[PDB]
Amino acid sequence: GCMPEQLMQNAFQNHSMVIKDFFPSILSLAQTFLHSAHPAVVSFGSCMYKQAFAVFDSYCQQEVVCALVTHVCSGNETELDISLDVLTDLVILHPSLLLRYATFVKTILDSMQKLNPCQIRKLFYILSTLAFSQRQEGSYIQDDMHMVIRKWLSSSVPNHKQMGIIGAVTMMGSVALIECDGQLSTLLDLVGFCCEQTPEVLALYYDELANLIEKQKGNLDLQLLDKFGKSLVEDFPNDFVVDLSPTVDGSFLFPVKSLYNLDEDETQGAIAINLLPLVSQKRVVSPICLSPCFRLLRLYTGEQNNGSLEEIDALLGCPLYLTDLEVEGKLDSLSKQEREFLCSLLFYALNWFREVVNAFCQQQDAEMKGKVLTRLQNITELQNVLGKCLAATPGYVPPPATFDSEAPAQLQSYRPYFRELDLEVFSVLHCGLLTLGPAELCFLLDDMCWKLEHVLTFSHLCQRSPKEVAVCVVKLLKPLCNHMENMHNYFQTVIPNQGVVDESGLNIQEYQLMSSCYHQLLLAFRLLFAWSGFSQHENSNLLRSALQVLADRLKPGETEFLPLEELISESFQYLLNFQASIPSFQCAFILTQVLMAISEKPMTGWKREKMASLAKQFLCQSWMKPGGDREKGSHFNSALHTLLCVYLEHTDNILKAIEEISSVGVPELINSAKDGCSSTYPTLSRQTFPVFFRVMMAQLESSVK
Amino acid sequence: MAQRILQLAAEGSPERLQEALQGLTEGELGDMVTRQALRGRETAALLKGIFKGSPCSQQSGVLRRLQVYKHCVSLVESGDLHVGKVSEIIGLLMLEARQLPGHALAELATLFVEVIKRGSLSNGKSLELFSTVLTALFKKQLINTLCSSKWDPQCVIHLANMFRDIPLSGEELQFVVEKVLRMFSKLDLQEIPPLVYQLLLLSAKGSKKTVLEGIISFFNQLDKRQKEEQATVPLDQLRHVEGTVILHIVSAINLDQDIGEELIKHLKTEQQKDPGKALCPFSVSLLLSTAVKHRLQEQIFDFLKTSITRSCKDLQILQASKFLQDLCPQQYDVTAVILEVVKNSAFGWDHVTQGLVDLGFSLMESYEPAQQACKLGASILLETFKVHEPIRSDILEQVLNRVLTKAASPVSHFIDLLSNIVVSAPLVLQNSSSRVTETFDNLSFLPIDTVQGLLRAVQPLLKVSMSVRDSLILVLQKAIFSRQLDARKAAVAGFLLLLRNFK
């Protein structure tokens, strides 16, 4: 915790002359404290190397690039990534200096026996940024690049074939902005023949066409962009999805109606059900042409358009030509043609729709809004049918989806094959109350949460910034979670008595996972509002700029209100809702942790004593748990340790209440009943009294001894 | 023939191309050598043109495919084309090449340089396609009679730079070696640089022994000859050849330089005749300029030590004899070797010859015959101060504070060495005295004898300039008013009992 990087960065700003004779020291240490396994040390040493490049003489400037390249040739894993990071930083940090060590830079090019697709993209990026600089050294880089190209392209090794395309696209996009037009044309037709019989390599060409498209803003140039795209001009409408005229029969078992057919678009068209018509029965099944290629063409529609709106309208609800799949038992007594045919069809359909929304989300036209609602509805419904087929594909429903094309019946059996959800189109702060339809909060929020904790503290997901992740979360968090929590807590608190009327059709229909959605939403509040990296010059002011809209009920005050009680009081006013109807103990530990993260900063009057209120209420929350296996006894006492230790966390170790709490174990073996040595409520249980009283004896007799 | 393939197979699947060229009959290869300066991308236009006949490497194109092959691999293999078309024809070729017929692709292609390279070569581009067809899969019998069996100027680069992707080192290393001598040696300055670099990289497979022993073996034959007959010079081009073969061994020295240690002190220093192997100039110049790095102190210091030791303590123990010292062998003097290397390294082998100044300051003191060893180390440090004029100013500063701040043993060795160094210093500090003017004050705690010799040794330099003396007088005078032990006296008299006392 001492020795901040702020210091050493200062050191370079004040220790030029006093530092200059350090030359063996900075260097000979940095590679001992810049390949060592604790995140502060590595971040420090990286500050070292980069700063070293900031301050040195000629031989110093060289000694740096040499130590780098020596790391780059032979190395370890974290040293690998650190080497590339240090590099890309140096080389995109100040271009016009970092070229003098060029030919030394190249000497890795014909020894670099190490790549992942990732680092391969990286090294290509370094070499592209260098190569577009010089003339003849960029020639010889062209020699090694055509060289690695042609040798790749002829390679029959499994990694070599895709690696070729990944760097091929990589160096091309590096081209993307002498006889470079001609050499690149030679490569152009070269890649052309090189893929023109490969479908997956197709999908490489497309998808890898995408990321370079989107991650530029004014460097992708239309006269330049026209080349690689024109054969991707009509290619989607040219062959992708076969037309819809009411007599097009042929080879099929399932009658290809407009079954599952949206028709949320207009009432006249030939953007038919192209699925059965041009994919499945189509030629051999097309893995990414129908979905990833639609992604690429919608990518050209977005970036290639720059405001495109009707180019996907002309079938904006052209509904796929899968026959109505209600006979899942009408698939029973058969399999392996309709089974796998349905599996690839469901994968493709989820693809067609999820792309229709993923490119259809952030488009802010009204009829787009209604179509997106209808799409989410069809998505949930086909997801129900697809889950029924997931059970109906017990055993073999492999990932025929686009598996990123870049590598070389349960809950998680569909984690890979799904497409990639967007980066600005997970936000619609106006999905109103249902009981935004019923499942829509659960879907858009599960897609928020399944990675929103990954960034805080999939490749198109992580390509954004977690600092930008916080920036967008601050920019768009309160306007949705505010209305959601405010309605939903009291709705679950007052509808539960309506569940007492036999209203399980309201219980398992109105909010059968409405509690689960609440518990998600609370976990999101806890993960976002407390960023682990708040402890710095940025995330502290971030947490404050989030508090400045946290104030739910009443105002925050003036132009500044530095005392946090407006914060803790917005927190008490928030806890006023779900102090009435918390849906379950699984949500109990959640309400506790979410109080404890941000509402539990200071432990004092009404707050540490409020910690007394919270622990005594957590004990006071009377038990609700049916009896089965011992699953809830894995965390329902680990959470109980936090709860009792929270009532004794706001306070000290409870050598006062722990006596009757162990006496609560004396009623706790009374029967199949909770903590009941005069209590008779939760905070205890059949098996949970034993471990819980053991932990209470821990929290008392680990200190009182 | 622009309409030709694109009208036969232009429009039509089953009988269009086969018919419109069932006998197009320009040989096998009409258009691409009927329009040499063809229509832009016609190279691949016609290439898929013929490709309408059948696949690449396919047997069915007995005249079509294989004759596109015969045309390109030779005419555009050596003559004139477009360098870019010299990429394109080979591109489309390499691409189609995966689909060959399991006999129909065996061209003159096991030693079929004897088909093309043995008499027709000089353009490198064509070499890769051999790699392509080879990778398509032994046939290397022509390789046995010729790893370069006519490689006059083009069995050095071109054959190697593809011997990378599809080479064999069992006779390919050795064959490179045997070629190196007066064929490969024909290049002046290309004899060991380019082929050496390729040689090592191709060594990356292996051949630590056979690829190690030769670089220096050839180097040492060249040296022993051009010495016993009487970048540097027409007789210093040993400078360039040394600069390459060293800097290459040093740079690639990472992973297998444990093997260079292992051999070049497991062969010569085992059968003991290493005085003619483990000590040649260009065979240890590596040993102690590829050792100023980090993993090198611990092996290089010990090697040179045990060498100086066993060498001297033998080649004296037969210097008192006749009944075993005159009807008896010769001896090559390891001391004479190291003293040679100090002579030869005046040419520029900079990071090959700072291992010396380090060798001096870290043997000629701390070494401890034993007295003979220290006596030797005087030579390395002193001579290195002798010859190569830019790199010794830091030598002297290593010395002064190696021997003006220590326990009592540091009188003799380092004291005599400082005496001889400054004494041989022809005004070596005679305008560079700025380490001293803050050395001088440190002395008021030295032993009884040391303060004298420090005064005496510096006594050469005192004759120069009042910037030495006007600061000496003060940093001593201050001692007299206070405790002022014998040191103020040794100094008062030394300035007085000296010509500096006059005026």
PDB file of N, CA, C and O in Angstrom, chain A residues 197-217:
ATOM      1  N   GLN A 197     -13.352 -21.213 -51.577  1.00  0.00           N
ATOM      2  CA  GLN A 197     -13.901 -22.536 -51.394  1.00  0.00           C
ATOM      3  C   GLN A 197     -14.065 -22.895 -49.932  1.00  0.00           C
ATOM      4  O   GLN A 197     -14.476 -24.018 -49.633  1.00  0.00           O
ATOM      5  N   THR A 198     -13.757 -21.987 -49.012  1.00  0.00           N
ATOM      6  CA  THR A 198     -13.867 -22.308 -47.594  1.00  0.00           C
ATOM      7  C   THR A 198     -15.028 -21.539 -46.981  1.00  0.00           C
ATOM      8  O   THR A 198     -15.050 -20.303 -47.064  1.00  0.00           O
ATOM      9  N   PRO A 199     -16.033 -22.206 -46.397  1.00  0.00           N
ATOM     10  CA  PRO A 199     -17.119 -21.441 -45.754  1.00  0.00           C
ATOM     11  C   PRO A 199     -16.726 -20.780 -44.448  1.00  0.00           C
ATOM     12  O   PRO A 199     -16.895 -19.563 -44.300  1.00  0.00           O
ATOM     13  N   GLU A 200     -16.196 -21.566 -43.507  1.00  0.00           N
ATOM     14  CA  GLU A 200     -15.784 -21.042 -42.214  1.00  0.00           C
ATOM     15  C   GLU A 200     -14.781 -19.920 -42.383  1.00  0.00           C
ATOM     16  O   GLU A 200     -14.951 -18.851 -41.801  1.00  0.00           O
ATOM     17  N   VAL A 201     -13.765 -20.129 -43.217  1.00  0.00           N
ATOM     18  CA  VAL A 201     -12.856 -19.052 -43.587  1.00  0.00           C
ATOM     19  C   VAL A 201     -13.631 -17.877 -44.158  1.00  0.00           C
ATOM     20  O   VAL A 201     -13.231 -16.718 -44.003  1.00  0.00           O
ATOM     21  N   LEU A 202     -14.751 -18.159 -44.822  1.00  0.00           N
ATOM     22  CA  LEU A 202     -15.710 -17.109 -45.096  1.00  0.00           C
ATOM     23  C   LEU A 202     -16.029 -16.364 -43.815  1.00  0.00           C
ATOM     24  O   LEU A 202     -15.725 -15.172 -43.698  1.00  0.00           O
ATOM     25  N   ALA A 203     -16.513 -17.088 -42.805  1.00  0.00           N
ATOM     26  CA  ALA A 203     -17.025 -16.441 -41.604  1.00  0.00           C
ATOM     27  C   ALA A 203     -15.926 -15.679 -40.909  1.00  0.00           C
ATOM     28  O   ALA A 203     -16.170 -14.636 -40.306  1.00  0.00           O
ATOM     29  N   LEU A 204     -14.716 -16.200 -41.000  1.00  0.00           N
ATOM     30  CA  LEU A 204     -13.548 -15.445 -40.616  1.00  0.00           C
ATOM     31  C   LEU A 204     -13.530 -14.119 -41.340  1.00  0.00           C
ATOM     32  O   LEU A 204     -13.496 -13.071 -40.692  1.00  0.00           O
ATOM     33  N   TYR A 205     -13.627 -14.147 -42.677  1.00  0.00           N
ATOM     34  CA  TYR A 205     -13.539 -12.917 -43.462  1.00  0.00           C
ATOM     35  C   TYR A 205     -14.612 -11.928 -43.037  1.00  0.00           C
ATOM     36  O   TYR A 205     -14.334 -10.751 -42.794  1.00  0.00           O
ATOM     37  N   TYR A 206     -15.815 -12.430 -42.796  1.00  0.00           N
ATOM     38  CA  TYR A 206     -16.902 -11.540 -42.423  1.00  0.00           C
ATOM     39  C   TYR A 206     -16.698 -10.998 -41.013  1.00  0.00           C
ATOM     40  O   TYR A 206     -16.419  -9.802 -40.837  1.00  0.00           O
ATOM     41  N   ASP A 207     -16.768 -11.886 -40.008  1.00  0.00           N
ATOM     42  CA  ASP A 207     -16.787 -11.474 -38.610  1.00  0.00           C
ATOM     43  C   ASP A 207     -15.588 -10.624 -38.311  1.00  0.00           C
ATOM     44  O   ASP A 207     -15.733  -9.503 -37.827  1.00  0.00           O
ATOM     45  N   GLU A 208     -14.417 -11.069 -38.769  1.00  0.00           N
ATOM     46  CA  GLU A 208     -13.212 -10.271 -38.662  1.00  0.00           C
ATOM     47  C   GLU A 208     -13.298  -9.045 -39.542  1.00  0.00           C
ATOM     48  O   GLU A 208     -12.516  -8.109 -39.371  1.00  0.00           O
ATOM     49  N   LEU A 209     -14.232  -9.015 -40.491  1.00  0.00           N
ATOM     50  CA  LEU A 209     -14.514  -7.748 -41.133  1.00  0.00           C
ATOM     51  C   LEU A 209     -15.206  -6.816 -40.157  1.00  0.00           C
ATOM     52  O   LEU A 209     -15.085  -5.590 -40.255  1.00  0.00           O
ATOM     53  N   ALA A 210     -15.944  -7.382 -39.215  1.00  0.00           N
ATOM     54  CA  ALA A 210     -16.793  -6.541 -38.384  1.00  0.00           C
ATOM     55  C   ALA A 210     -15.968  -5.657 -37.458  1.00  0.00           C
ATOM     56  O   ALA A 210     -16.011  -4.423 -37.568  1.00  0.00           O
ATOM     57  N   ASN A 211     -15.176  -6.287 -36.581  1.00  0.00           N
ATOM     58  CA  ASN A 211     -14.516  -5.607 -35.473  1.00  0.00           C
ATOM     59  C   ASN A 211     -13.654  -4.460 -35.953  1.00  0.00           C
ATOM     60  O   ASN A 211     -13.633  -3.397 -35.337  1.00  0.00           O
ATOM     61  N   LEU A 212     -12.983  -4.638 -37.078  1.00  0.00           N
ATOM     62  CA  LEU A 212     -12.209  -3.542 -37.637  1.00  0.00           C
ATOM     63  C   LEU A 212     -13.121  -2.431 -38.108  1.00  0.00           C
ATOM     64  O   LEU A 212     -12.745  -1.255 -38.078  1.00  0.00           O
ATOM     65  N   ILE A 213     -14.328  -2.782 -38.544  1.00  0.00           N
ATOM     66  CA  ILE A 213     -15.273  -1.762 -38.978  1.00  0.00           C
ATOM     67  C   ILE A 213     -15.667  -0.891 -37.799  1.00  0.00           C
ATOM     68  O   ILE A 213     -15.488   0.331 -37.819  1.00  0.00           O
ATOM     69  N   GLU A 214     -16.128  -1.525 -36.720  1.00  0.00           N
ATOM     70  CA  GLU A 214     -16.811  -0.790 -35.654  1.00  0.00           C
ATOM     71  C   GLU A 214     -15.844   0.003 -34.792  1.00  0.00           C
ATOM     72  O   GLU A 214     -16.188   1.078 -34.303  1.00  0.00           O
ATOM     73  N   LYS A 215     -14.628  -0.501 -34.607  1.00  0.00           N
ATOM     74  CA  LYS A 215     -13.695   0.125 -33.677  1.00  0.00           C
ATOM     75  C   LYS A 215     -12.910   1.254 -34.330  1.00  0.00           C
ATOM     76  O   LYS A 215     -11.857   1.654 -33.831  1.00  0.00           O
ATOM     77  N   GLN A 216     -13.378   1.750 -35.463  1.00  0.00           N
ATOM     78  CA  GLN A 216     -12.856   2.965 -36.075  1.00  0.00           C
ATOM     79  C   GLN A 216     -14.026   3.936 -36.146  1.00  0.00           C
ATOM     80  O   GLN A 216     -15.185   3.514 -36.117  1.00  0.00           O
ATOM     81  N   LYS A 217     -13.725   5.234 -36.232  1.00  0.00           N
ATOM     82  CA  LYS A 217     -14.788   6.240 -36.243  1.00  0.00           C
ATOM     83  C   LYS A 217     -14.653   7.218 -37.412  1.00  0.00           C
ATOM     84  O   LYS A 217     -15.657   7.724 -37.923  1.00  0.00           O
TER      85      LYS A 217
END
